[PDB]
Amino acid sequence: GPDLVQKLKVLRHELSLQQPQAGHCRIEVSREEIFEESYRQIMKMRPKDLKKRLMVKFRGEEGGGVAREWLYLLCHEMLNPYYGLFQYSTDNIYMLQINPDSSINPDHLSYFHFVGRIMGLAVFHGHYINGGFTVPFYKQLLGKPIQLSDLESVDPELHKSLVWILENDITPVLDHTFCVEHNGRILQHELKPNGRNVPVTEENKKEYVRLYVNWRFMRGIEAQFLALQKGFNELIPQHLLKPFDQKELELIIGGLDKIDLNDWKSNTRLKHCVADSNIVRWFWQAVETFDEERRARLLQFVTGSTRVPLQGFKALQGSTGAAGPRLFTIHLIDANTDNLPKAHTCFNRIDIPPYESYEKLYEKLLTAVE
Ligand SMILES: CCOC(=O)c1c(C)[nH]c(C(=O)N(CC)Cc2ccc3c(c2)OCO3)c1C
């Protein structure tokens, strides 16, 4: 709380001291080749050059304020799975993770080092990017261990079984060793040296669960993660992150998930209504009134998910029909004003009856959502 506020000020003050008063960090890339061009221009600089005031300009545009736009666009474009560095999770929708098969590109480690530098530059200049990584990824990047509690949301079944180990006498029921498996070929991993020959007992099961928790996230991505963290720490040294505790890191990480209302409203299709009509202004008014958890519940009420792809509301998918985005739709219909708004989750549509006032829309929409 108030100690977190002050820790953030110490961090920002320390970072500001590393920025030279004179000098600039010059970048000039195109929008359609921002990843490859930024890769070559950034990997040419010293870490101290990256700490200079950003001097950015796009391909052939006049545009200071362009450096904010450049960094934000590069932060989202570098996570695009086309580049083979990151892939979507099969545990939670629209979440990202390092692709363990990134070894295909033999220069992958220099690209992960580059991604780390850009993530470090975002923190350095005060940008909050909703990268969509898991809480364990972000804790590890910020220099802290993963907690068993952080596994519950990613892998509830593994979490339940590791919790079972810690809370019960395993002796008459389980016969595990410090060796774990995962995939086409089956790969064995010894959690600690000679692990295959170390049976899990009451005496060492705490170490077993602790090692298994880390492996569940680090599995096949350890070299990639190390290079990423290396780039990140060239901008954000690990000692400056030491004061933040597990709880403060969870608050900072949860704040990254903020739904972008600008991107939501810019990418909303309107059916039988205009952008200035009372029903549409009242809907966006009620959304602004809702806290984050209520904004997430509204997004889940209409789309079935509490998140949107990394590209944003423009990449929103529908369930059926021709391939292509199915934008979030506000549909003003002809219906009973006592009726609730109706969600058509297959098509990301909310059918809204013609309410008389803002206060009636707010209550009906809140009743539908809660
Ligand atoms: C401990 C103090 O934390 C901070 O002050 C802080 C600030 C100012 N920004 C960030 C932050 O946004 N990220 C963490 C690196 C997420 C992120 C950035 C760039 C990305 C990305 C995700 O996906 C690819 O590009 C944090 C945590």
Author numbering: 375 to 437, 441 to 560, 563 to 749
What's the publication's text?
The structure of SMURF1 is typical of a NEDD4 subfamily member, with a N-terminal C2 domain for cellular membrane localization, WW domains for target recognition, and a catalytic HECT domain that binds E2 and mediates target ubiquitylation through a surface-protruding catalytic cysteine. At the cellular level, SMURF1 acts as a negative regulator of bone morphogenetic protein (BMP) signaling, which modulates cell migration, proliferation, and apoptosis. Ubiquitin transfer requires a motion facilitated by a flexible hinge that connects the HECT domain N- and C-lobes. To gain structural insights into the mechanism of selective inhibition, we crystallized the HECT domains of both SMURF1 and SMURF2, without and with a representative SMURF1 inhibitor, compound-8 (Cpd-8), and determined structures at 2.05–2.75 Å resolution.
In complex with SMURF1, the inhibitor is buried in an N-lobe cryptic cavity, with only 2% of its surface exposed. This shortens the hinge (from 27.0 to 15.4 Å) and replaces G634 at the stem of the flexible hinge with lysine (K637), an amino acid with a lower tolerance of the ϕ/Ψ dihedral angles. In the presence of Cpd-8, the αH10 is displaced, inducing allosteric elongation. In this altered confirmation, an electrostatic bond is formed between the αH10 D636 and C-lobe R686. R686 is further stabilized by N507, which is allosterically shifted toward R686. The independent mutations D636G, R686A, and N507A did not alter enzymatic activity but conferred resistance to inhibition by Cpd-8, thereby demonstrating the importance of αH10 stabilization of the inhibited form of SMURF1.
